[PDB]
């Protein structure tokens, strides 16, 4: 339980994976998404005493052979006895012994096991020697990437040492490390070591279930790179994996050299990751340059949250291979409409249902502006689907435009023929009335961006929006008295604050004849309400006051708080009213520079 | 000071290095061994308001050209104006601009600066374009290892992004990142970008001050590897560095292919480390496999605690080069006596002063057993230096023996002809009377180990040590009565507890005639005091009770506490008395199995 020299053997619940370590102060952390059942006992070689907590007493060390029995491997001991390796590891020298546990021998192929028991003198001794090193090497001495010649024919032992502490030999993890023996050190490993493969390329060419994948490799000329030296991690999709793909998609990706090359590189890692090195979620950069998320649930390895791994830890000379049930497809190999996620499904479905899906050709370059599913209300989907189709046509571009390519004042051409204004702010980018969210992606034939609202290009100008509402009438007169009608009719970029007639009625119309006498002061009072450029409340960062220079030249302050626009610390009635040449914010009272 | 949108510009005290970041909650940490002077001001574009803490107000963004002046680069602005780049970066598009600060232009070579002012239309525009990217890329979008084509002739911009947050372009660090502009983003870099070198090999061959180093490379055939693609960090020793070496050492290392190859690889890193990425101490694995410790003191880069770096951040296509004043010599390229550290100096000096230094040949393989300087007392160095030389001859072996090659019961042959017994325990390794410390190293021609005490091979056997002290007399008789004289005379491994005659006098000699009648019980009582194998108190782990099986078969317990051996929880008088065939522990009372 607790005390000196107490060792804890953890087993991940629902799995056969076991971790042995000294009982420290903090190891109740769960591994691979599951908690563990712990088994407390004296560390091997240590003994309990009467009336004493823990195991204060220790037994003298033995040689490597006796240590095999000390660490709990009876089967490795017996095979060492039958092959007459016992007398070597009891004798003079220094030996590191990587000893499969009893379970590890149980999991060995029965024909291979009886095949080793068939010849004890040669084959069994050669395998056990393949498990050994000519000098004593503790776990700290086993460094990631080391290739250590074994005691049989100088067979390479491929060492991996990971930040989490996992140490593996040919991807076999060391459960119980550093058992000190007079003759050397004994480590217990979770599997029996096997002959190393020629290379990843040779395994792909030799394997029939990789027949599909192999083909694609030869098309991308990336198979030759997998036959040279290195440390790789290859997730190999099986024939089942390619047959699980939608019809024609594999043909379309194979027909394109860039899509095939990127697809291939997306399955490869530049480092050697054994399955036993994964205790949880992590991100790895593939050779394509996008990252895959590798994790574990129980004993099942997960890739991008899905568990595709059936056969794992196939160790070759140049790296490790894990078989997967699916095909990892990077965004760079995907058609644009395939870049959409969960929150775009409605959009993704609508363009498919209303006949715009076929309109995105593989030979073209397109941009999807995709409102989230929350941006489609019931009243929206209640409209006649042909008007809805016209609205969706404003969300598709016939040119690919990346998020890094956008700029303020840019105009985009929808496939529906209309024009979208781009407004770039410091913290936000808003196309027409709708502003972008995070999560833009770029595919093979185009790019996709995500919007909070449905994009509705403004059909009416400033002047038209002014003369169509009665509450603005007086103000419009003043704007026409200022000779600003031509500005309100013609295109441009403007931010206009419109006081309602309710604001002029606060002056009881007598200040209208008072200020009607001033020709110059009317120009100041009016021009203070107009600012160059379009500034909408959705684009501001919340809580921040915005200092803008009006066309009158005096400063005006715009602060969006709780999705409510405040102009000079006065709450606006209506805000963000989009026109063709500008934006309108309706205010309660008449504005003065002050 | 404090508030919203407050930005802090730190300057490392005693250096011109500057770091700009938003005022967060914790950045008072010192950089590169020194504290910083901080300058608080509103983040560019943000403004103070009356009665408000911090800078709650923000100004609208400008284009890239205006942002140059916003971020504080007037010189980049002026050069952009003179080359007519201004009208491009004020216009339509999306531009990332890496803008040298004013200081960065000041540090540019005056002939290069006036040389750019000489032609504004072509050369200046081509350099400024070499500082720019065709799309907007924030610092998070700049990934380590990226090569991004610039806007002049698709010149590669080599991006590096380090865990500490440092982002560099051609090793130029970005002081102020992510200034958002309508036309793109502006980053401020600490130096003017320059033409990238052909490769590291080409720079070595072109440089005369590397003439020495270049030669060694061609001898090790590692120069061709430095001409291929990759990301490297090369610390290049100058001609001064090789001339600073002891005479004949460079010739000896060059004459040996393994020493030269390891020496060369020890100067190379497999990753690109810019000088500006170093905020403090870190360890890096070289191509030789040993690690070098890289750090910084002020603006001086340190390697292995020494500051050898004068010229730094020489950027080529395949990596970076930093010039060093010394030659990094790995242990694998060193002669054995050169492996000694500070605490071995006395030993290192003694073998040199008494004539044993020349006795270690480059053609041989040797092992040094080196006591720490504290292991030489005044009385030790007061003895005649020829006897001292005989003692040192027991500390040298004519065969190389690694720490991983040692095993219990091994016998070593000193060059002085004597023989050393090796005792391997679980937590300790003791040669004869002295036990090993940490810090063993392996060199080219041998290995070195560190000991707490001077090794003194035992000259007397158990029987001789017994009959030469009177206090043991009675006990010796009993041992001879048990027919154990032949065991005490002949070689072996034994642990013997010797009760003094003071213990038998506690029985008043009447129990000597009482127990003298029993022939069988005397064998038990006597044989309980003898155990097979040599167990010394220095080798035990402190506080741990040791269960040993005596040659009588009953258990005995040995616990070393406060450097005092306790046998069955009884403090021994004298402990760890070394003989040829065993060890003697003197006890106060007679021992019984109980
Ligand atoms: Ca370790
Ligand atoms: Ca175990
Ligand atoms: Ca704007
Ligand atoms: Ca960042
Ligand atoms: Ca700055
Ligand atoms: Ca021993
Ligand atoms: Cl489970
Ligand atoms: Cl541990
Ligand atoms: Cl947990
Ligand atoms: Cl137990
Ligand atoms: Cl035990
Ligand atoms: Cl070896
Ligand atoms: Cl672990
Ligand atoms: Cl371990
Ligand atoms: Cl050993
Ligand atoms: Cl992990
Ligand atoms: Cl998703
Ligand atoms: Cl339809
Ligand atoms: Cl994008
Ligand atoms: Cl891009
Ligand atoms: Cl933005
Ligand atoms: Cl309307
Ligand atoms: Cl327009
Ligand atoms: Cl003002
Ligand atoms: Cl300093
Ligand atoms: Cl920041
Ligand atoms: Cl500090
Ligand atoms: Cl300020
Ligand atoms: Cl400012
Ligand atoms: Cl580009
Ligand atoms: Cl930083
Ligand atoms: Cl930064
Ligand atoms: Cl932009
Ligand atoms: Cl650092
Ligand atoms: Cl030192
Ligand atoms: Cl001498
Ligand atoms: Cl060593
Ligand atoms: Cl070695
Ligand atoms: Cl040890
Ligand atoms: Cl003596
Ligand atoms: Cl001996
Ligand atoms: Cl007992
Ligand atoms: Mg043992
Ligand atoms: Mg076993
Ligand atoms: Mg491995
Ligand atoms: Mg396949
Ligand atoms: Mg594994
Ligand atoms: Mg949607
Ligand atoms: Mg009105
Ligand atoms: Mg507009
Ligand atoms: Mg608003
Ligand atoms: Mg700006
Ligand atoms: Mg400047
Ligand atoms: Mg760089
Ligand atoms: Mg040189
Ligand atoms: Mg740098
Ligand atoms: Mg010394
Ligand atoms: Mg006696
Ligand atoms: Mg002995
Ligand atoms: Mg002692
Ligand atoms: Na012991
Ligand atoms: Na703004
Ligand atoms: Zn303005
Ligand atoms: Zn024993």
Curated annotation (Swiss-Prot), chains A, B:
<dbReference type="GO" id="GO:1990523">
    <property type="term" value="P:bone regeneration"/>
</dbReference>
<dbReference type="GO" id="GO:0009612">
    <property type="term" value="P:response to mechanical stimulus"/>
</dbReference>
<feature type="domain" description="EMI">
    <location>
        <begin position="3"/>
        <end position="57"/>
    </location>
</feature>
<dbReference type="GO" id="GO:0007155">
    <property type="term" value="P:cell adhesion"/>
</dbReference>
<dbReference type="GO" id="GO:0014911">
    <property type="term" value="P:positive regulation of smooth muscle cell migration"/>
</dbReference>
<dbReference type="GO" id="GO:0008201">
    <property type="term" value="F:heparin binding"/>
</dbReference>
<feature type="disulfide bond">
    <location>
        <begin position="32"/>
        <end position="296"/>
    </location>
</feature>
<keyword id="KW-1015">Disulfide bond</keyword>
<keyword id="KW-0358">Heparin-binding</keyword>
<dbReference type="GO" id="GO:0001953">
    <property type="term" value="P:negative regulation of cell-matrix adhesion"/>
</dbReference>
<dbReference type="GO" id="GO:0071307">
    <property type="term" value="P:cellular response to vitamin K"/>
</dbReference>
<dbReference type="GO" id="GO:0031012">
    <property type="term" value="C:extracellular matrix"/>
</dbReference>
<dbReference type="GO" id="GO:2000343">
    <property type="term" value="P:positive regulation of chemokine (C-X-C motif) ligand 2 production"/>
</dbReference>
<feature type="domain" description="FAS1 2">
    <location>
        <begin position="197"/>
        <end position="328"/>
    </location>
</feature>
<dbReference type="GO" id="GO:0005615">
    <property type="term" value="C:extracellular space"/>
</dbReference>
<protein>
    <recommendedName>
        <fullName>Periostin</fullName>
    </recommendedName>
</protein>
<keyword id="KW-0333">Golgi apparatus</keyword>
<dbReference type="GO" id="GO:0030198">
    <property type="term" value="P:extracellular matrix organization"/>
</dbReference>
<keyword id="KW-0130">Cell adhesion</keyword>
<feature type="disulfide bond">
    <location>
        <begin position="171"/>
        <end position="274"/>
    </location>
</feature>
<keyword id="KW-0325">Glycoprotein</keyword>
<dbReference type="GO" id="GO:0009888">
    <property type="term" value="P:tissue development"/>
</dbReference>
<dbReference type="GO" id="GO:0003073">
    <property type="term" value="P:regulation of systemic arterial blood pressure"/>
</dbReference>
<feature type="disulfide bond">
    <location>
        <begin position="430"/>
        <end position="435"/>
    </location>
</feature>
<feature type="disulfide bond">
    <location>
        <begin position="42"/>
        <end position="55"/>
    </location>
</feature>
<keyword id="KW-0732">Signal</keyword>
<keyword id="KW-0272">Extracellular matrix</keyword>
<dbReference type="GO" id="GO:0062023">
    <property type="term" value="C:collagen-containing extracellular matrix"/>
</dbReference>
<dbReference type="GO" id="GO:1900025">
    <property type="term" value="P:negative regulation of substrate adhesion-dependent cell spreading"/>
</dbReference>
<dbReference type="GO" id="GO:0044344">
    <property type="term" value="P:cellular response to fibroblast growth factor stimulus"/>
</dbReference>
<dbReference type="GO" id="GO:0032355">
    <property type="term" value="P:response to estradiol"/>
</dbReference>
<dbReference type="GO" id="GO:0014850">
    <property type="term" value="P:response to muscle activity"/>
</dbReference>
<feature type="disulfide bond">
    <location>
        <begin position="7"/>
        <end position="43"/>
    </location>
</feature>
<dbReference type="GO" id="GO:1990138">
    <property type="term" value="P:neuron projection extension"/>
</dbReference>
<feature type="modified residue" description="S-cysteinyl cysteine">
    <location>
        <position position="23"/>
    </location>
</feature>
<dbReference type="GO" id="GO:0031594">
    <property type="term" value="C:neuromuscular junction"/>
</dbReference>
<feature type="domain" description="FAS1 3">
    <location>
        <begin position="331"/>
        <end position="455"/>
    </location>
</feature>
<dbReference type="GO" id="GO:0008593">
    <property type="term" value="P:regulation of Notch signaling pathway"/>
</dbReference>
<dbReference type="GO" id="GO:0071560">
    <property type="term" value="P:cellular response to transforming growth factor beta stimulus"/>
</dbReference>
<keyword id="KW-0964">Secreted</keyword>
<comment type="function">
    <text>Induces cell attachment and spreading and plays a role in cell adhesion. Enhances incorporation of BMP1 in the fibronectin matrix of connective tissues, and subsequent proteolytic activation of lysyl oxidase LOX.</text>
</comment>
<dbReference type="GO" id="GO:0005802">
    <property type="term" value="C:trans-Golgi network"/>
</dbReference>
């Amino acid at each position: 339980d607790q005390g000196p020299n107490v060792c804890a053997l953890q087993q991940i619940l629902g799995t056969k994976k076991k971790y042995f370590s000294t009982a420290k102060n903090w190891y109740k952390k769960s591994i691979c998404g599951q908690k563990t059942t712990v088994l407390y006992e004296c560390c091997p070689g240590y003994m309990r005493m009467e009336g004493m907590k823990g195991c204060p007493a220790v037994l003298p060390i033995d040689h490597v052979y006796g240590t095999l029995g000390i660490v709990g491997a009876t089967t490795t001991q017996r095979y060492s006895d039958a092959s007459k390796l016992r007398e070597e590891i009891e004798g003079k020298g220094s030996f590191t012994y990587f000893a499969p546990s009893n379970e590890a021998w149980d999991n060995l192929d029965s024909d291979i096991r009886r095949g080793l028991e068939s010849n004890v003198n040669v084959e069994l001794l050669n395998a056990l020697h393949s498990h050994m090193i000519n000098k004593r090497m503790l776990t700290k001495d086993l460094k990631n990437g080391m290739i250590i010649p074994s005691m049989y024919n100088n067979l390479g032992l491929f060492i991996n040492h990971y930040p989490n502490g996992v140490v593996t030999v040919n991807c076999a993890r060391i459960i119980h490390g550093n058992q000190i023996a007079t003759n050397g050190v004994v480590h217990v490993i979770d599997r029996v070591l096997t002959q190393i493969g020629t290379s990843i390329q040779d395994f792909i060419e030799a394997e029939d279930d990789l027949s599909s994948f192999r083909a694609a490799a030869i098309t991308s000329d990336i198979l030759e790179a997998l036959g040279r030296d290195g440390h790789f991690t290859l997730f190999a999709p099986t024939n089942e994996a390619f047959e699980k793909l939608p019809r024609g998609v594999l043909e379309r990706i194979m027909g394109d050299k860039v899509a095939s090359e990127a697809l291939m590189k997306y399955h490869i890692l530049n480092t050697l990751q054994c399955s036993e090195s994964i205790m949880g979620g992590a991100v790895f950069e593939t050779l394509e340059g996008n990252t895959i998320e590798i994790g574990c649930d129980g004993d099942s390895i997960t890739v991008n949250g899905i568990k595709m791994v059936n056969k794992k830890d196939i160790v070759t000379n140049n790296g490790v291979i894990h078989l997967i049930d699916q095909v990892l497809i990077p965004d760079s190999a995907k058609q644009v409409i395939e870049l959409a996620g969960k929150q775009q499904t409605t959009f993704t479905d609508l363009v498919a249902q209303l006949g715009l899906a076929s309109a995105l050709r593989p030979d073209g370059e397109y941009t999807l502006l995709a409102p989230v599913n929350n941006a489609f209300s019931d009243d929206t989907l209640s409209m006649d689907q042909r008007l809805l189709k016209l609205i969706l046509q404003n969300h598709i571009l016939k040119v690919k435009v990346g998020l890094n390519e956008l700029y303020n004042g840019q105009i985009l051409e929808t496939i529906g023929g209309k024009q979208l204004r781009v407004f770039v702010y410091r913290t936000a980018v808003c196309i027409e009335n709708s502003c972008m969210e995070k999560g833009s992606k770029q595919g093979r034939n185009g790019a996709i961006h995500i919007f909070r609202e449905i994009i509705k290009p403004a059909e009416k100008s400033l002047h038209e929006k002014l003369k169509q509402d009665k509450r603005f009438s007086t103000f419009l007169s003043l704007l026409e008295a200022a000779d600003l009608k031509e500005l309100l009719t013609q295109p441009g970029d403007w931010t206009l604050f419109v006081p309602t007639n309710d604001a002029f009625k606060g002056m009881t119309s007598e200040e209208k004849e008072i200020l009607i006498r001033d020709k110059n002061a009317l120009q100041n009072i009016i021009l203070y309400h107009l600012t160059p450029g379009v500034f909408i409340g959705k684009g501001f960062e919340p809580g921040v006051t915005n200092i803008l220079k009006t066309t009158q030249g005096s400063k005006i302050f715009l602060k969006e708080v709780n999705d409510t626009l405040l102009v000079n610390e006065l709450k606006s009635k209506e805000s963000d009213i989009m026109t063709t040449n500008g934006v309108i914010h309706v205010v309660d009272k008449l504005l003065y520079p002050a």
